[PDB]
């Protein structure tokens, strides 16, 4: 399950290929437009909320 990630305050974008099950658990059972603190996505996502 690949992730399209965009940062609107700068304009940079890339697609990240993720083949893990723990990272997708937080996103499961959620709706669109729900700002959620995705901290399990990686080490740099500690303070990032998407």
Which chain residues interact with RNA by CB under 7 A? 2, 4, 6, 13-15, 31-34
Q: How far is the CB of 4 from RNA (least distance, A)?
A: 5
Distance between CA atoms of residues 8 and 31, nearest Å: 20
Q: How far is the CB of 34 from RNA (least distance, A)?
A: 6
Q: How far is the CB of 3 from RNA (least distance, A)?
A: 9
| Contact between 18 and 1 (Cβ < 8 Å) | yes
Residue 37: name the closest of 47, 28, 22 by CA.
47
């Amino acid at each position: 399950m690949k992730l399209n990630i965009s940062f609107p305050a700068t304009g940079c974008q890339k697609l990240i290929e993720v083949d893990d099950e723990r990272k997708l658990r937080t996103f499961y059972e959620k709706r669109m437009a729900t700002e959620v603190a995705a901290d399990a996505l990686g080490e740099e996502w500690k303070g990032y909320v998407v």
